[PDB]
Design an enzyme around this catalytic site. Structure first.
Site, PDB file in Angstrom:
ATOM      1  N   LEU C  34      -0.823  -0.257   9.654  1.00 33.05           N
ATOM      2  CA  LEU C  34      -1.470  -0.497   8.416  1.00 33.05           C
ATOM      3  C   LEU C  34      -2.387  -1.989   8.608  1.00 33.05           C
ATOM      4  O   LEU C  34      -2.061  -2.857   9.319  1.00 33.05           O
ATOM      5  CB  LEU C  34      -0.456  -0.896   7.502  1.00 33.05           C
ATOM      6  N   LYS C  36      -5.858  -4.405   6.549  1.00 36.38           N
ATOM      7  CA  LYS C  36      -6.004  -4.969   5.459  1.00 36.38           C
ATOM      8  C   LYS C  36      -6.552  -4.005   4.309  1.00 36.38           C
ATOM      9  O   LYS C  36      -6.326  -4.205   3.139  1.00 36.38           O
ATOM     10  CB  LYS C  36      -7.340  -6.162   5.699  1.00 36.38           C
ATOM     11  N   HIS C  38      -5.661  -0.889   4.073  1.00 35.75           N
ATOM     12  CA  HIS C  38      -4.462  -0.251   3.420  1.00 35.75           C
ATOM     13  C   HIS C  38      -3.727  -1.345   2.487  1.00 35.75           C
ATOM     14  O   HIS C  38      -3.391  -0.831   1.410  1.00 35.75           O
ATOM     15  CB  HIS C  38      -3.529   0.226   4.212  1.00 35.75           C
ATOM     16  N   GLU C 149     -12.473   4.571   0.395  1.00 29.72           N
ATOM     17  CA  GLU C 149     -13.848   5.359   0.470  1.00 29.72           C
ATOM     18  C   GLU C 149     -14.486   5.311   1.846  1.00 29.72           C
ATOM     19  O   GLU C 149     -15.474   6.023   2.140  1.00 29.72           O
ATOM     20  CB  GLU C 149     -15.025   4.336  -0.589  1.00 29.72           C
ATOM     21  N   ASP C 151     -13.209   6.810   4.116  1.00 27.57           N
ATOM     22  CA  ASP C 151     -13.106   8.203   4.403  1.00 27.57           C
ATOM     23  C   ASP C 151     -13.641   9.149   3.286  1.00 27.57           C
ATOM     24  O   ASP C 151     -13.146   9.627   2.604  1.00 27.57           O
ATOM     25  CB  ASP C 151     -11.759   8.461   4.706  1.00 27.57           C
TER      26      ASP C 151
HETATM   27  N1  LIG Z   1     -11.334  -0.107   5.896  1.00 32.78           N
HETATM   28  C1  LIG Z   1     -11.105   0.597   4.905  1.00 32.78           C
HETATM   29  N2  LIG Z   1     -11.266   0.185   3.759  1.00 32.78           N
HETATM   30  C2  LIG Z   1     -10.560   0.596   2.590  1.00 32.78           C
HETATM   31  N3  LIG Z   1      -9.652   2.026   2.754  1.00 32.78           N
HETATM   32  C3  LIG Z   1      -9.591   2.469   4.006  1.00 32.78           C
HETATM   33  C4  LIG Z   1     -10.153   1.743   5.096  1.00 32.78           C
HETATM   34  N4  LIG Z   1      -9.601   2.273   6.216  1.00 32.78           N
HETATM   35  C5  LIG Z   1      -8.826   3.373   5.906  1.00 32.78           C
HETATM   36  N5  LIG Z   1      -8.719   3.196   4.427  1.00 32.78           N
HETATM   37  C6  LIG Z   1      -7.849   4.250   3.528  1.00 32.78           C
HETATM   38  O1  LIG Z   1      -6.527   3.962   3.723  1.00 32.78           O
HETATM   39  C7  LIG Z   1      -6.009   5.385   3.458  1.00 32.78           C
HETATM   40  C8  LIG Z   1      -4.752   5.761   4.574  1.00 32.78           C
HETATM   41  O2  LIG Z   1      -5.663   6.011   5.796  1.00 32.78           O
HETATM   42  P1  LIG Z   1      -5.322   6.458   7.164  1.00 32.78           P
HETATM   43  O3  LIG Z   1      -6.448   6.140   8.126  1.00 32.78           O
HETATM   44  O4  LIG Z   1      -3.952   5.699   7.379  1.00 32.78           O
HETATM   45  O5  LIG Z   1      -5.165   8.093   6.985  1.00 32.78           O
HETATM   46  P2  LIG Z   1      -5.491   8.592   5.369  1.00 32.78           P
HETATM   47  O6  LIG Z   1      -6.703   9.361   5.428  1.00 32.78           O
HETATM   48  O7  LIG Z   1      -5.161   7.368   4.622  1.00 32.78           O
HETATM   49  O8  LIG Z   1      -3.965   9.566   5.279  1.00 32.78           O
HETATM   50  P3  LIG Z   1      -4.514  11.290   5.226  1.00 32.78           P
HETATM   51  O9  LIG Z   1      -5.546  11.630   5.891  1.00 32.78           O
HETATM   52  O10 LIG Z   1      -3.202  12.127   5.596  1.00 32.78           O
HETATM   53  O11 LIG Z   1      -4.539  11.262   3.616  1.00 32.78           O
HETATM   54  C9  LIG Z   1      -6.812   6.515   3.427  1.00 32.78           C
HETATM   55  O12 LIG Z   1      -7.348   6.843   2.129  1.00 32.78           O
HETATM   56  C10 LIG Z   1      -8.208   5.713   3.881  1.00 32.78           C
HETATM   57  O13 LIG Z   1      -9.268   6.296   3.483  1.00 32.78           O
END
Ligand SMILES: Nc1ncnc2c1ncn2[C@@H]1O[C@H](COP(=O)(O)OP(=O)(O)OP(=O)(O)O)[C@@H](O)[C@H]1O
Ligand SMILES: Nc1ncnc2c1ncn2[C@@H]1O[C@H](COP(=O)(O)OP(=O)(O)OP(=O)(O)O)[C@@H](O)[C@H]1O
Ligand SMILES: Nc1ncnc2c1ncn2[C@@H]1O[C@H](COP(=O)(O)OP(=O)(O)OP(=O)(O)O)[C@@H](O)[C@H]1O
Lengths: 278, 283, 284, 277
Positions: C34, C36, C38, C149, C151
Site C-alpha cells: 500500500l 499514499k 491507497h 483515477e 487507473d
Molecule cells: N497514485 C494513485 N492515486 C490514487 N489512486 C491510486 C494510485 N495508484 C493506484 N491507485 C488506486 O488504488 C486502487 C488499488 O490499486 P492497485 O494498484 O492496488 O490494484 P487495483 O486496480 O486497485 O485493484 P483491482 O485492479 O483488483 O481493482 C485502485 O483503484 C487504483 O486506481
C-alpha cells in the site's frame, strides 16, 4: 393486492420495507406466457419465503440482434410483486457488459459458438442485482441454464440460493411449456412419445445399459416409432459438466431430448441414476 | 415458530447464538415421511435439550442402484406440520443441491461393522449412512443426536464412528416404537397392502419366539437361527434375505448363547418392502 | 481494533452486525503493498461511511501468462500496520484458495472498453479485473466503493459495469496521488532501480507537455501522439507501449482535439516496470 | 509459556474458555522432526489467530500395520500456546474400525489404493478433537493438501485450510527432515531438484505443450547430475491430479521424486495460472 412495478428504482423502493423487516425474498424470473409450471415455481417460492417477486421480461440479449392474463394468474397465485420492465427500463442504453460461463455454455446446443448462454447469465446476474433476493427458483426443464446459473452463482459469490424445481407435466406426461399450444390435435397426441422416451431411457438404464451410443440409438428408434416426431438432439451427458460420458452405470446421467413435432420444438430431460459411495 | 432452513450456511447462522450461550442442541436426523417413531425421537430430544433440530433428507448415498430412491415417500408439508406441533425449533430440509453441491469424493465407512448383516444384502449402504451422518454432525454441531434402535446395526456403526473419530456428540438410542399390533414403525411400511400388513406380524412374533427359546435354555447359534427361519416360513409371503444371530456389540457371530446377550436381526422382505427388525435377548 | 479476515463466509459473518445496525460500508479494493494513494482512498471512504473495509488480493486473473504475478510486491504485515493506523475496520486478505476454491468457469467482461488502450497491450486484463471486482462487490455488499483515477480506464470500465449490471454500489473516483517529482504513486514503483526511477519522471512530464500542446491549439490526434512519442524518446530508458489519445467516456479514437475533453493515456515501460499515467485535458 | 498436553479430554478442557470467548484457534498438525518449514507454518497460524496449537504425532494409520525435547524447544521459542503430544494409546485407545478416504484423489501419483486413507482419517479426528478455526499445511506435500481440502469441503468440516508456501534453504532446496541424511557431496548435488523446477518453469514459458516432451526434458536435465536419480516425474492437473492432454493455457503441477544416493527428496511447483475464460 399484487403490486406491478416497471422501473428498477421503483422496485428497489418497493422492497425497502421487506429489507428493513428482514423478510425472506423469493424470486421467480420468467419471460411471461405463464403456465402451470411457472405457478409451481411461485408456489415453492411462497412456501419458503415471506415475500415473492416474479419478473416478466423477454430479454433481447438471449435472442439475436433482430400480459393482463399473466398478471391475473400471478394475482391469483398471491404474488407480492410483479416486475415487468420495458426493454428501456432494463436497458436504457445498450449493454456493453457481458457475463458468460463458457465451458458450460459451449456444451450441447452451445456446440462451438459465441456465448450461447451469455444473454441468460447476464440478464439473470442483473436481475439478482435489482431484486436482491434470498432465493431464486428455476425449472429443471431448462437444465443447462440451471447448471450454468448455479455455477455463475458459486463463481461470482452471488448471495442467492438457487432452487431447481422438478418439471411439472400435463396429465398425459408432456412437459408443461407455452410452446405446447402450437401443436395441432394430431401433433399433441404424437408428442407423448417425448416423455415416454425418457421412461424408456430409465428402463434401459435400470436393466444395466452402459454404452451411451447404445442408449442414444435405443431412444432414437423408440421415438422414431412416431413418424411425426423427429429427434433433432438426443444428448446423454454428465449432469455436472454436461460433457460426453465414457459409460453410464454407477453415475447419474442427463438425458436431454430435443424433438420436433410438426414445426414445434419440444424439450424434455431427466437425470437417471445417482452417485454411490466412493 | 419452527424455522424451516434449507442451507448449511443459514442453519449454522441460525444456531450460532444458542451455541455461544452454552445451550444444548439435540438433533434428530431423518429421511422424512414422519411416523410415531420419529416423533418419539423428537420428544426425547425436546425434553433433553434447549434447542431441538430435525433434518429431513433422503440421502442418495445410502440407496443402491436398484432400490427404492425414486419411490421413497416424500411429503415435506405434512412432515413440517407434525414437527411444528411437536415444538421443534429448526427443520433442516435441504435439497440434494444444498447438501451435495458437487459430487462427493469423500467417503466415511466402518467396514468391519458395515459389511455384514444388512450390509451383505446392501453393499455400500452403511458407507452412505456413515458419510451423511458425519456431514450432518459437522453441519449441526449438536450436543446429542437421536437414533432409533429399530435400525440397530446403524446405531452400533454410528456409535463406533463417533468414538473412533472423537466426534463430540452424545449418541442416544431410543427403543423401537411399535404400532398397535406390534409392527415396527417405518416409513417404508406404506408400500405394504393390507394383506401384506397382516402377513408382516410374522416379524414381531418371530422375535418373541427367539425370546422364550432363549428363555427355554436353547444354546446353539444355528439351532436358534433354524428355529427362526422355519417360524417365519409359516407365513409364505416372507422372503428373508437375512436372519442373523450376533454379538450385539461387535456384530460378529457367536459360539454359544446362554449367559450372554444376543442380538437377533431380521431382514425379511414381504412383497416389495424389505422389513427390518431387531431384539437384544438375554444378559 | 481493525479485524483481519481471510474467507468469504468469515467476512459476511463479520459484516452482518453492521448491516443489522444500518451502517454504511465503504470499500477500497487493492492488490496490497500500500502507498499514499491507497491511503487517500481509505481516508475518503472513512469520511462517507460508518465502516470501512479494505481488500488486499493479488488477483491472478488480471495477470497475463508472462507478466509479473510471481514478483508482484507483497508485505501484508506492513500493509496491516498502515491500515490499523488509518483506522480501517476490516481487512479482507484472502489467499488464492479462499477467493478461488475451484477454477473459475465464469467471466465478466466489458469488451468495448476493455479491449482498448492498456487492453491492447494486455489482452484479457480487463476481463480479470471486471470479474474479480464483481465478485468482491458480491462478497462485501458495500454502499460505496473507491477507485483511483490513476487507473483511469479501469474506473471507466467499473462505472460502466456497475450501471450495466445494476450493481447497487456508489462508485467514487479519487484523484491521482503523486510522489514529490510528479510520478503517480503505484506499488510497482518499487521495481524501479535508482536510475529507472530518475528516468521515470518522463511520464508525468509527457502529460504536462500534452497539456501544453493542447493549450497551444494542437487539433490533430496523430500529431499529438507523435509529439508525445518524440518527447518520451528523449529518455532512452523509456519505451512507450501505448500512447492513446481518446474520448474519455468511450475510450475510442477521435477525429480532432479542440473544443472537447481528451484522454491522454500513457503505458510506458522503464526496465521491467510498465508505468501507467493519464490526464483528461480540455473540457466540453 | 507453552502448555504440553497428551490426552483428548485434557486438550478439550484447555481450549474450552478460549472457544467460549470466540478466540480464533490456529492448528498445525505435524509428526515432529521440526525444521524452519514447520516454524513458518506456526508463524502464519500465530499471525492469523489468537491461540495456536501444534500437534506432534506419528500416526500408524498412515504407516504399514507392522526427540520430543528438540521439537518442544523450538515450539516454546516460537511462542506456541499448546503442544499436543499424544501417545498412540491417547489417540487410539482401541483399534480404529472407521476409515475416511478421498479415493479419486488418493488413487493418483503415489496412490497409483487406500494410500491416503491414513492421513484423511487422522486429520479428520484431529479436527474433531481440536475444533480449530484454521489449519496450516505445507504446499510441499501437495497431494495431501489437495485431499484435505476436498475432504473438508465434502464433509462440511468447519475449518479453513491454509496452504503455506514451501520454506527453502540458501540454494533453493526445499526444507526437510530428510536433508540431514545427505553427505555434503550429495547436498551440493541436491540443488538439481529446485533447478529442475526452474527449468520446468522455463520450458513452459517457452510454449512447450506436450506433457511427455516435458517429462523427457526434465528426465534429461536431472541426468546432468549422476548422484541424482529421478524416481517419478508427475506432470498433472493441480485440481484433480490426473494426467493432462496438453500444457499451455492451464496451470500444471510438476511433482518430482528424486533419489539422491539413499535419501528421497520431494519438491513440486504449480506452473502457470488460470486466465479469464
Ligand atoms: N497514485 C494513485 N492515486 C490514487 N489512486 C491510486 C494510485 N495508484 C493506484 N491507485 C488506486 O488504488 C486502487 C488499488 O490499486 P492497485 O494498484 O492496488 O490494484 P487495483 O486496480 O486497485 O485493484 P483491482 O485492479 O483488483 O481493482 C485502485 O483503484 C487504483 O486506481
Ligand atoms: N419404528 C421405529 N422406532 C423407533 N425409531 C425408528 C423407527 N423407525 C425408524 N426409526 C429411527 O428414526 C431415525 C430416522 O430414520 P429414517 O428411516 O427416517 O432414516 P435415518 O436412517 O434415520 O436417516 P439416516 O439413515 O440418514 O441417519 C432413524 O435413526 C431410525 O432408526
Ligand atoms: N519445506 C517445507 N515448507 C513448508 N512446510 C513444510 C516443509 N516441509 C514439510 N512441511 C509441512 O510440515 C507439516 C507437517 O510435517 P510433518 O511431516 O512433520 O507432519 P505431517 O505428515 O504433515 O502430519 P500429518 O500428515 O499427520 O498431518 C506438513 O504440512 C508439511 O507439508
Amino acid at each position: 393486492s399484487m403490486q406491478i412495478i416497471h422501473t428498477i428504482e421503483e422496485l428497489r423502493q418497493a422492497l425497502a420495507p421487506a429489507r428493513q423487516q428482514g423478510k425472506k425474498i423469493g424470486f421467480v424470473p420468467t419471460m411471461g406466457y405463464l403456465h402451470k409450471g411457472h405457478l409451481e415455481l411461485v408456489r415453492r417460492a411462497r412456501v419458503e419465503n415471506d415475500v415473492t417477486l416474479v419478473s416478466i421480461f423477454v430479454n433481447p440479449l438471449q435472442f439475436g440482434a433482430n400480459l393482463e392474463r399473466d398478471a391475473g394468474l400471478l394475482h391469483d397465485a398471491q404474488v407480492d410483486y410483479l416486475f415487468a420492465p420495458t426493454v428501456s427500463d432494463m436497458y436504457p442504453r445498450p449493454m456493453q457488459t457481458v457475463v458468460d460461463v463458457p465451458p458450460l455454455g459451449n456444451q450441447i446446443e452451445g456446440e462451438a459458438r459465441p456465448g450461447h448462454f451469455a444473454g441468460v447469465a447476464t440478464v439473470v446476474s442483473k436481475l439478482f442485482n435489482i431484486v436482491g433476493p434470498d432465493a431464486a427458483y428455476f425449472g429443471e426443464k431448462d437444465f443447462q441454464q440451471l447448471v450454468i446459473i448455479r455455477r455463475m452463482v458459486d463463481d461470482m459469490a452471488i448471495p442467492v440460493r438457487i432452487v431447481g424445481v422438478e418439471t411439472v407435466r400435463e396429465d398425459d406426461g408432456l412437459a408443461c411449456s407455452s410452446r405446447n399450444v402450437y401443436l395441432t390435435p394430431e401433433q399433441r397426441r404424437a408428442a407423448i412419445i417425448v416423455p415416454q422416451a425418457l421412461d424408456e431411457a430409465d428402463r434401459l438404464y435400470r436393466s444395466g445399459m452402459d454404452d451411451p451410443d447404445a442408449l442414444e440409438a435405443a431412444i432414437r428408434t423408440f421415438i422414431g416409432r412416431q413418424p411425426l416426431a423427429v429427434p433433432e438432439v438426443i444428448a446423454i451427458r454428465d449432469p455436472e459438466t454436461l460433457e460426453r460420458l465414457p459409460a453410464l452405470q454407477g453415475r447419474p446421467i442427463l438425458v436431454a431430448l430435443f424433438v420436433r413435432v410438426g414445426a414445434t420444438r419440444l424439450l424434455d430431460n431427466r437425470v437417471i441414476g445417482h452417485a454411490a459411495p466412493q
